[PDB]
Design a protein around this ligand. Structure first.
Ligand SMILES: O=P(O)(O)OC[C@H]1O[C@H](O)[C@H](O)[C@@H](O)[C@@H]1O
Lengths: 638, 121, 242
């Protein structure tokens, strides 16, 4: 007899202690919502980063008899059994909102048992394992240990049904071990991408979404030197009681490449922290956008012919992945946008930003010189106005005596002296630039300028920031950070300041970028092959979506050139909006933020943890409910 | 030798072929300009708290005229951005303040620069 | 009684016969203003000190990246003028903040002052409601409250206009146009005009409070007004904004 109403929960993953990729953020941000329902039932298992584990973990002593409640005693004694053999392991709290209990296993304290396990694994599930691949080596050690620990806990605890959740192939090895060893827990495995997915899309010549249905997986995994790893990810998907991806589009990709239709989607939430007043984010926008104006004034010094109340900021951001993150479509679409805006005789300007890290030798002389020449103009204008203020004051105070006929001065001449005029002219002269020169298209000295994809594309479509161009380009090959001397904004600040995010992704199992952008109340363009577009398509009628600031480009059932054209259509639909229109739209997109919070996305983890229980123990379930509910989906189940 | 505590900064100002200022020159003045601005933000915050204590004495628990404890004026939020400014001022291990502010066209052959290196200033 | 943390400063703006602002009122401002100016001067110095420390770290034996002791920042020269300004704000034992801001003519037979004297809202510390009668019209070049009337209204939280005779009631209306909630009565033109557009249930939620000065006795009314003020005072900031 076990309890389906009151159960344990073990979430295992390679990134529990340490930040490696997106996963760390997901598990972290999801902690609050979970402890608020499990408290000390909930546990997180993972390997130890000996080189960092102390900045993250408050190290709790797991022995003293108060460390665990009464029903959570089994876990303590199952922890004993691990210390018997020599299994070293840190226990404690993760220094993060929600402070969940975290079991960390040292890998080194098992490195010896390497060969036996590599061997045992080869004969159970058939998974090779070169010695030089240090990732899978670690990943096997982990999977075997965590399968051990989970065994003892099923031995002792006899009141709770145990559920274990694994994230990504690296932490998936334990999963086959739990089906062969027929151990008593219910497993979940969430994949956040697929191996063959990231790999088939790397070159960028492969037509992924049309030819994956006809891929020979074993053959391709072998072509890539990936066979062993692929087998683990495959074993994890087949062994798991429940099998989940992070989005509809990755579910497709996963069914034909991991050879199993996933039982559900588990979209990635954020920990959305709202301001006391709804309209606050709107004020933040205009403050942050002011810092951007400062950068722009500096950047276009001596060549500044448009109006900042009438310009919009677009940006793309993320890993430098020219083809997979759509940097190509973006630049291409901007060149098309530039034509459509010149032809309609609009006076708006779009300044487009590309924020993708590339090898560089820091900022250029030109970039830094300009901020400073503008900053010097600013200071001098400040001296002059103080003078002006003295002369206005002297007027007001002494009117109407000494022959002052007017309440206020009338001749600018009697406010602005000639020492004043010389000063200001000198600063203006500094702001001039060599005849012929245009504001550059990049803020840095690049390591390999001639061969740079992003820069070559800009030069091909000839967006060179000439006065006549209505779309301006600025590549900033570095992560935004508030101690940059030039664009002194942290990333999240920059976003609030911008008007529109544009992320035409090709391979993006989730796309934290547009999601995070949405939470700041900034409209964004995404695609239907992006996991966040694919999740939004299903929540909102696509014509109603533009009104919430979520534009979705079709990269799946349109021709390549039609996708680009659609992208320009959205960009241009947006530039046409008025200020009142842009404000109202942000309020709407801000409103959507709730649909991205854990308080709503965590109800999918729940639907998952309870398909693993309806599947583990259908007898105890039908009873501990009322009747029998369909169990082929997480969906059909509720 | 005389164990003096004084310091002499000597400027040489003689026009020589160059490609304008260096990145380090410009970058440094900017990182300091930023420390400046952050400090000035922090101090108006500090001022608002000093003013509060002052206007309120001797009431809600306030026993002394002035604050007596820095934690009452510098909050966590302020400490964090100052620390980040400082970190931006820090230079790569064992790098020294340059002896020249400009990128020099022909630097190996310059007479001033050769003389300085010989005497090892 | 309910042990409320909230405080309510009530203003009364009704032109009466007066001889300009009390000397105490103008001094009070100048005194607080002069503190402010001293505090800026002191924080400028503090800034030079934080800056020096920060530019210099970790050299010359600065172990920590920031100052840690107030003495490093706040020198005794600063401590001394700050204390002089703090003494100047001091008011003689027992003396309380006035209930009026001008020198009245015939202070004794003033209806407002007498009613306030009667109820005894004298601005003492335990009183959770304070009272300020400003017997002149608001205008932005008042030495004391440099605000135009409309500006003042945007400043406040609640307008209270329990008229008995009010054909229209421009006053709760300009208040309403500026997003400030208002208490009015059903014998006022505006109050009636509004009783028509929203059923009194919902009228509370749109920031229009109507007191029943018709089908209730004078005292059931005062009791209703007070009901309203307390329901308001119980509001969170997030609800006031809504
Ligand atoms: O940057 P825009 O979309 O033109 O928006 C400009 C507006 O932004 C925010 O709403 C500010 O609070 C407004 O005061 C400003 O008018």
């Amino acid at each position: 007899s076990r309890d389906l109403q009151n159960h344990l929960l073990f979430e295992t993953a390679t990134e529990v202690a340490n930040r490696v990729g997106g996963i760390y953020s997901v598990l972290k941000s999801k902690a609050p919502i979970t402890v608020a329902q499990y408290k000390d039932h909930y546990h997180l298992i993972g390997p130890l980063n000996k080189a960092t584990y102390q900045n993250e973990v408050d190290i709790l002593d797991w022995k003293k008899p108060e460390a665990f409640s009464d029903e959570m005693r089994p876990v303590q004694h199952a922890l004993q059994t691990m210390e018997s053999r020599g299994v070293h392991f840190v226990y404690g709290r993760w220094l993060i909102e929600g402070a969940p209990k975290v079991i960390l296993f040292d890998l080194d304290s098992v490195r010896g048992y390497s060969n036996e396990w590599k061997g045992d694994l080869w004969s159970l599930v058939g998974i090779p394992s070169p010695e030089n691949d240090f990732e899978t080596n670690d990943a096997i050690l982990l999977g075997y240990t965590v399968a051990w620990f989970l065994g003892e806990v099923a031995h002792l605890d006899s009141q709770h049904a145990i559920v274990a959740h694994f994230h990504e192939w690296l932490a998936g090895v334990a999963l086959p071990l739990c089906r062969k060893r027929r151990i008593d827990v219910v497993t979940i495995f969430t994949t956040h991408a697929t191996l063959l997915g990231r790999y088939l899309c790397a070159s960028g010549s492969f037509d992924f979404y049309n030819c994956l249905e006809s891929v020979d997986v074993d053959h391709e995994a072998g072509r890539f030197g990936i066979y062993h790893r692929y087998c683990i990810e495959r074993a994890a998907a087949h062994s798991a009681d429940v099998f989940t991806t992070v989005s509809q589009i990755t579910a497709f990709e996963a069914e034909h490449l991991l050879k199993r239709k996933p039982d559900g989607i588990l979209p990635n939430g954020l920990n959305v922290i709202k301001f006391q007043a709804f309209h606050e984010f709107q004020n933040l926008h205009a403050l942050k956008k002011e810092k951007i104006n400062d950068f722009v004034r500096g950047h276009f010094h001596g060549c500044f012919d448009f109006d900042l109340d009438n310009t919009l900021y677009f940006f793309i951001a993320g890993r430098y992945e020219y083809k997979n993150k759509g940097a190509d479509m973006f630049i291409e679409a901007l060149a098309r946008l530039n034509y459509r805006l010149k032809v309609s005789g609009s006076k708006k300007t779009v300044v487009a930003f590309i924020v993708m890290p590339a090898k560089n030798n820091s900022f250029t002389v030109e970039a830094l010189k300009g901020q400073a020449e503008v900053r010097a103009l600013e200071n001098t204008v400040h001296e002059v106005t103080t003078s002006i203020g003295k002369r206005i004051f002297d007027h007001a105070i002494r009117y109407p005596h000494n022959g002052l006929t007017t309440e206020l001065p009338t001749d600018l001449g009697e406010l602005l002296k000639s020492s004043d005029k010389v000063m200001l002219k000198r600063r203006i002269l500094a702001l001039r630039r060599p005849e012929g020169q245009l504001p550059p298209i990049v803020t840095h000295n690049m390591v390999d300028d001639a061969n740079d994809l992003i820069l070559n594309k800009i030069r091909q479509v000839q967006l060179f920031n000439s006065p006549s161009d209505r779309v301006k380009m600025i590549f900033h090959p570095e992560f935004l950070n508030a101690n940059n001397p030039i664009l002194g904004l942290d990333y999240d600040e920059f976003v609030r300041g911008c008007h529109l995010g544009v992320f035409p992704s090709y391979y993006e199992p989730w796309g934290y970028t547009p999601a995070e952008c949405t939470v700041m109340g900034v409209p964004s363009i995404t695609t239907n092959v992006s996991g966040f577009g694919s999740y939004m398509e299903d929540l909102i009628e696509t014509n109603q979506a533009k009104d919430y600031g979520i534009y979705i480009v079709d990269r799946r059932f349109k021709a390549p050139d039609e996708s680009v054209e659609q992208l320009v259509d959205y960009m241009e639909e947006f530039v046409k909006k008025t200020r009142r229109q842009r404000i109202n739209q942000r309020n709407a997109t801000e409103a959507l933020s709730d649909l991205l919070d854990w308080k709503r996305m965590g109800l999918e983890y729940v639907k998952a943890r309870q398909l693993a229980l309806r599947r583990g123990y259908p007898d105890q379930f039908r009873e501990l409910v009322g009747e029998e509910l369909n169990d082929s989906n997480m969906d059909a189940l509720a």
